[PDB]
């Protein structure tokens, strides 16, 4: 997450990118580099349901209080925009996570216009499963 752009510049150059075809390469290049998902993590109790595809997430709290993600899917477009959530929610602690209205930054980005129902439900499923996940936390 550290190799890939902060909320800020994510969105920033989603506002730059000239049309759909930009925007449709950027999910993708930007889905191939999240980190591989350790093998042990592919286990039912972190799959992710709704997205027509396969998807994983696994959300662990630090000692430091701050919620990491990783995750995988086999189809690109749903692993970048997974990418584009775990962006949105780097270094939030659970309780931001809870909080943090993400559909103001969701439409200035202006990408499920783009999406087929298919990958807009697998979207907001994603974020879905990572919020409840979130507000279980202490």
């Not at 286990?43 to 696994?58: A, D, E, F, L």
């Not at 690109?76 to 209205?101: E, N």
């Not at 216009?113 to 507000?135: D, F, N, V, Y």
Request: net charge positive.
């Amino acid at each position: 997450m550290a190799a890939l752009p902060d909320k800020e510049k994510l969105l920033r150059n989603f506002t730059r990118c000239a049309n759909w075809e930009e925007k449709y390469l950027y999910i993708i290049e930007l889905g191939q580099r999240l980190a591989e998902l350790n093998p042990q993590d592919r286990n039912p109790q972190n799959t992710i349901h709704g997205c027509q595809s396969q998807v994983w997430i696994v959300m662990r709290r630090n000692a430091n209080g701050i919620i990491e993600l990783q995750g995988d899917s086999d189809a690109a477009i749903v692993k970048g925009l997974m990418a584009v959530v775990f962006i949105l929610y780097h270094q939030m602690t659970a309780q931001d996570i809870v909080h943090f209205d993400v559909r103001p930054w969701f439409e200035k980005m202006a990408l499920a216009q783009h999406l087929t129902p298919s990958r807009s439900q697998g979207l907001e499923a994603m974020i879905r499963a990572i919020r409840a996940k979130a507000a279980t936390l202490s």
